[PDB]
Amino acid sequence: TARKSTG
Amino acid sequence: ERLLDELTLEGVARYMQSERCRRVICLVGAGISTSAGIPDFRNLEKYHLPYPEAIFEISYFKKHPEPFFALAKELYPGQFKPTICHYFMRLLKDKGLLLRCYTQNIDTLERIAGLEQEDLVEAHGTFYTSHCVSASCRHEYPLSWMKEKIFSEVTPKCEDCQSLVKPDIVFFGESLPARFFSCMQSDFLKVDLLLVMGTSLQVQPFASLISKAPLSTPRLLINKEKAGMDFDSKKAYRDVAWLGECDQGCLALAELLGWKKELEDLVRREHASIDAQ
Ligand SMILES: [Zn+2]
């Protein structure tokens, strides 16, 4: 899954 | 479909009062906790960070955890007391209107306000519990243990395997809990209203949640600033922005709904209970 990112 | 009569707070309130609006998802961020004395995370000069954001990145943290824990000491509140906005969500729960609260926050204030585990998707984890980072160990530590380490300025270290211990927050670069994706797959298939509060929707994949709702689902933003949302163009049909602090937005909405007295009583008795501890 998409990792926690600033954008 | 067009479900709001007008693109106003009054329009949203009328919609909420109608039979059609049965299930509401709340999407919340840092702005709902600023009036609880927890600043928007977005002395430290001594660490010579490569850039300010490195303090919340997992790769940097695992090798240099000291700046994060130094900041934690300064940010740690003297009390955990939920806001008017948190208690507005409690009213949604008690009136059978809350499908889910998805939170970006790690402060446990939704729990303290009386939202139960099943009501919540803590998308970025929690400060409440902590664990050793070693997969073969995973020793758990409670908030009192973590707080003691933070205030004594001793880096949390596992008493068994000597590895780093971290609060159960999702650092930038980490995966979100499976629950986030599991609930997303169900909740956004059938939802009557999105209430987006205290977030500018700049963190992914949380920010993508607004697009997952059906195209007809109205969306109200309560935030100090504007945020794929369309408030102002000629094609605007479902999105409403109320600009200001989250507490004042929730008070304005509660008044329109006829809940102002109920909300104020709830906040006051719950705050009294917390202050009496
Ligand atoms: Zn360990």
Here the CATH number for the domain that contains residue B42 is: 3.30.1600.10
Q: What is the resolution of this structure in A?
A: 1.6
> What is each CA distance from B245 to B113, B257, B271, in whole angstroms?
19, 19, 19
Question: Is B10 an interface residue toward A (CB < 8 Å)?
Answer: no
Which of B53, B175, B202 is closest, CB to CB, to A3? B175
In the reported structure, the alpha carbon of residue B161 is separated from the centroid of ligand 1 by a whole-number distance in angstroms of: 4
> How far is B228 from B264, CA to CA, in rounded Å?
34
Is B43 flagged in the annotation as binding? no
Range(s) of the domain holding residue B132 = 35-82+124-177
Is B170 in contact with A4 (Cβ distance < 8 A)? yes
> What is each CA distance from B6 to B231, B250, B265, in whole angstroms?
12, 19, 30
- Assess whether B134 and B240 both reside in one domain: no
Is B104 flagged in the annotation as binding? yes
**Residue burial B81-104, b: 16+ Cβ < 10 Å; e: rest:** bbbbbbbbbbbbbeeebbbbbbbb
- Assess whether B19 and B71 both reside in one domain: no
Give the count of beta carbons closer than 10 Å to the beta carbon of residue B243: 11
- Assess whether B162 and B48 both reside in one domain: yes
Q: Which of B151, B177, B203 is the last residue of a domain?
A: B177
- Assess whether B113 and B130 both reside in one domain: no
- Answer yes or no: are the C-beta atoms of B250 and B263 closer than 8 Å: yes
Residues in chain A: 7
B43: exposed, middle or buried (C-beta count within 10 Å: 0-12, 13-18, 19+)? exposed
- Assess whether B132 and B252 both reside in one domain: no
- H or E element in which residue B255 lies: helix B246-257
- Assess whether B94 and B148 both reside in one domain: no
Give the count of beta carbons closer than 10 Å to the beta carbon of residue B133: 18
Which of B53, B174, B181 is closest, CB to CB, to A3? B174
Q: Which of B177, B203, B222 is the last residue of a domain?
A: B177
- Assess whether B152 and B273 both reside in one domain: no
- Assess whether B40 and B8 both reside in one domain: no
Active-site pick, B48, B86, B124, B139: B124
- Assess whether B118 and B133 both reside in one domain: no
- Answer yes or no: are the C-beta atoms of B84 and B251 closer than 8 Å: yes
Enumerate the β-bridge partners of residue B132: B165
Residue B123 one-letter amino acid:
A
- Answer yes or no: are the C-beta atoms of B120 and B182 closer than 8 Å: no
Is A6 in contact with B203 (Cβ distance < 8 A)? yes
- Assess whether B61 and B17 both reside in one domain: no
- Assess whether B59 and B28 both reside in one domain: no
Instruction: Record the tokens describing residue B57, joined without a space.
Output: 């990145």
Q: What total number of domains does chain B contain? A: 2
Instruction: Record the tokens describing residue B213, joined without a space.
Output: 């709702």
Peptide bond into B205 cis (omega under 30): yes
Instruction: Record the tokens describing residue B183, joined without a space.
Output: 């609930």
DSSP state of B164: B
For B155, residues 6+ apart whose C-beta sits below 8 A from its C-beta are B65, B66, B69, B149, B164
In degrees and rounded to multiples of 5, residue B97 shows phi and psi of -100, -15
Instruction: Record the tokens describing residue A6, joined without a space.
Output: 């600033």
Is B123 flagged in the annotation as binding? no
- Assess whether B221 and B94 both reside in one domain: yes
> What is each CA distance from B211 to B27, B184, B205, B207, in whole angstroms?
12, 11, 11, 8
